[PDB]
């Protein structure tokens, strides 16, 4: 019960708590930081800030943080995206006030000593090579650089020339300008509401307002090709869509589930995916197709994603793109819009089910909109999407300027103008 | 208001103290190896898959 | 005297010799091979073929080639471009018939043994890193990849994923298909004409005919950006122009010297360069500008090249591009076209002056046109360029679709659409 | 008919037997180090400094 208590402090801080009666607690701090707020003189500072959560602070050494958290069996983790950073602490219910003091030292009073920051530079090379063993990681960083000119073009991982050169003064400047109280949300899941507030006036003493004024993201319709020795071709093709929290964004979410956004049956043949059935009419080799969707605070991208063999890559991309054209000129049954609404509603209620998914869902609502909405208000917005709104979103894709990124053996892959 | 992870497809990396580095939501997306021949190649440096996050006690 | 003897054999081979009475001789073999004839399954084969000139052949081991050439004080070298390969031998006049047998073994009977080709793979990494210490090497390989879709987008150096994987069967296939008699020219500089002919029927026994049918190059108007840690920004901006050996190609050569193509005085302020004077009106930092020209058998590129500091890179490129627009709408004095013809004529006679420059000039004429022309016929073609033809070449640049490549700190560099 | 090197600007690399690897015709073009400092290579894979212009006889 007790759905959520929600409070805005007089300088911007958002505090929200729910009292379960579960044996474990989870506390998260969500900040408007991330790789979209760095310019071309400090690329990769947000990647090193993510790796530095257990260094010496003003209230605890690096030995006390590692030993004190492990003594009670707790955890500490950092999650980032292009627009957000999240610091999360979890333990058993009797120990949570010990781990709250550690979390406020990592975010509100860091020191960045020279000899500790210099020993951490080699971790940047290890973390990037582990992530790039998945071929989707590099395709999706190249796709954002092809689609934008600034802000959302910046990668999540540090560039190679820059490893070894992130200085302690660059770290001090990033935290001082982006980690302020009007950009922060403190979210608790197994604690009380007055105890989080008294925690909040121990970093209400400083970092008092908004930060700096990142720039708007300008769209660029570009192409990035990457010939290598991988055995399969990955490719993505997008256009500009719609920002988070608008009526057109809900129509693009419905259109994603009309075309197909991942399977439901283990080893099933994807019988209700429109994109998958159209490609499989003429292609009898292994492949995979999906619709892609990515929504941000001021822009969005929508398109398709293929994985194929090298000699079949042009056949797969043309068949998939020809299916979206059929929808944009009116061919859209009414029983297909209804089955897409069921997959979108059921996927939203299954993603808020665990404590990690629920804490993430509440924290992103407090940064972007500054409020909390129940899942019955969300489910009404999905049912108010009309069939003409879905056809209008498929016409914005077909007529819009495209961006592309591909990798593998690209000798049979089409160029974005062909 | 709805998250990056709510509509599927933009990336997220995670870092720990006691657990392993992870990437993305729908990256190992299914019916890719289920039509056959996606071998997963061996490392010179990486993380452990289980992430330890799932053991019964 | 004795200007040149010129002969075509009945299967395509071209033989040309001049009898000086100089103490040293030079003999070159020129072939229509090079990086434009490889497809996406064998990239980097031409780079490894260039490095393999002293491996074991059917008539001499790798020990005999190195020891036999060094015993008389001779040389052996290979020069390549995107469209041509050239094998050159030089020694004193009494020793030249010893070094001719070595040169016909390197090109007409190579063996590619496994253990020798495997030890040579690490030389590809050394040769590429030495060449890329000059920042113009990587900018000019990225510019060709941005400008073409294929044929003329392949680099001179092997790609990084491909080092270690060029197989002996790929080398055997390249030589068998591209090193044939109707694509070859044998040029001698201190020898007689009947002695080169008897050498020629020693490899007239095999490898007859044209080879294979590379494809036409297809123009792509693209962009490649490369953020790094270099201290200066390099940038190039081109459009499609004209093929080698046409009347419009001579007009683009005159236009290059109108704008400026390198200095004549050591530490001079470039008083007769149009591009240099226009940039220096408002920019008071160190820089360098030049006009760029590159002509090929079926296409060409023309444009500008700047080197500047990072905060001034957009100011320099706009000032330089605004000067070409002034020429394209008629502002072109008659005493400027005449001073450009003098620099073009004098530079052509100074480049054919030494034995290395003269042998190169004769060998490229025999591959492309199949004839030899005296420098008085060349000097007439330059004087027949009219002033209206120069203005027409500057209008083809201004209205044509652009390609771009840049490197450095690119935070103030414009995109190709701005 | 006129060469790559005759109009200035497309690239050429050279390999030798007893001499050093070279690149291009006009690449490092003059009135570039006339101003500022174009400080030159800090070498890590050292190829030569003067290109075999000695042993004149």
Short mmCIF file of N, CA and C in Angstrom, two decimals, chain C residues 2 7 70 77 97 102 106 125 150 182 195 281 289 308 335 406:
data_model
loop_
_atom_site.label_atom_id
_atom_site.label_comp_id
_atom_site.label_asym_id
_atom_site.label_seq_id
_atom_site.Cartn_x
_atom_site.Cartn_y
_atom_site.Cartn_z
N UNK C 2 68.63 11.33 -80.23
CA UNK C 2 68.13 9.98 -80.46
C UNK C 2 66.79 9.72 -79.78
N UNK C 7 58.25 1.13 -79.49
CA UNK C 7 57.83 -0.07 -80.20
C UNK C 7 56.71 -0.75 -79.42
N UNK C 70 73.98 -6.21 -54.22
CA UNK C 70 74.89 -5.42 -53.39
C UNK C 70 76.35 -5.58 -53.79
N UNK C 77 63.97 -0.96 -56.26
CA UNK C 77 62.89 -0.27 -55.55
C UNK C 77 61.55 -0.47 -56.25
N UNK C 97 73.29 -5.79 -67.36
CA UNK C 97 72.71 -7.03 -67.86
C UNK C 97 72.66 -8.13 -66.81
N UNK C 102 67.65 -10.33 -62.72
CA UNK C 102 67.01 -10.32 -61.41
C UNK C 102 65.63 -9.68 -61.47
N UNK C 106 61.76 -11.37 -60.32
CA UNK C 106 60.86 -10.80 -59.33
C UNK C 106 59.46 -10.58 -59.86
N UNK C 125 52.84 -3.83 -40.43
CA UNK C 125 52.55 -2.96 -39.30
C UNK C 125 53.61 -1.88 -39.13
N UNK C 150 33.56 2.80 -54.49
CA UNK C 150 34.46 1.64 -54.75
C UNK C 150 35.46 1.98 -55.86
N UNK C 182 49.80 -7.16 -72.04
CA UNK C 182 49.11 -5.98 -72.55
C UNK C 182 48.87 -4.93 -71.51
N UNK C 195 68.68 -4.86 -77.29
CA UNK C 195 68.98 -5.71 -76.14
C UNK C 195 67.77 -5.81 -75.21
N UNK C 281 43.77 38.03 -44.69
CA UNK C 281 43.16 39.33 -44.44
C UNK C 281 42.58 39.42 -43.03
N UNK C 289 47.44 27.18 -46.70
CA UNK C 289 46.37 26.82 -47.63
C UNK C 289 47.03 26.41 -48.93
N UNK C 308 45.36 24.58 -39.88
CA UNK C 308 45.10 25.73 -39.03
C UNK C 308 45.10 25.30 -37.57
N UNK C 335 46.56 39.14 -66.74
CA UNK C 335 47.94 38.96 -66.31
C UNK C 335 48.09 37.88 -65.24
N UNK C 406 38.51 15.46 -42.29
CA UNK C 406 39.19 16.32 -41.34
C UNK C 406 39.72 15.50 -40.18
#
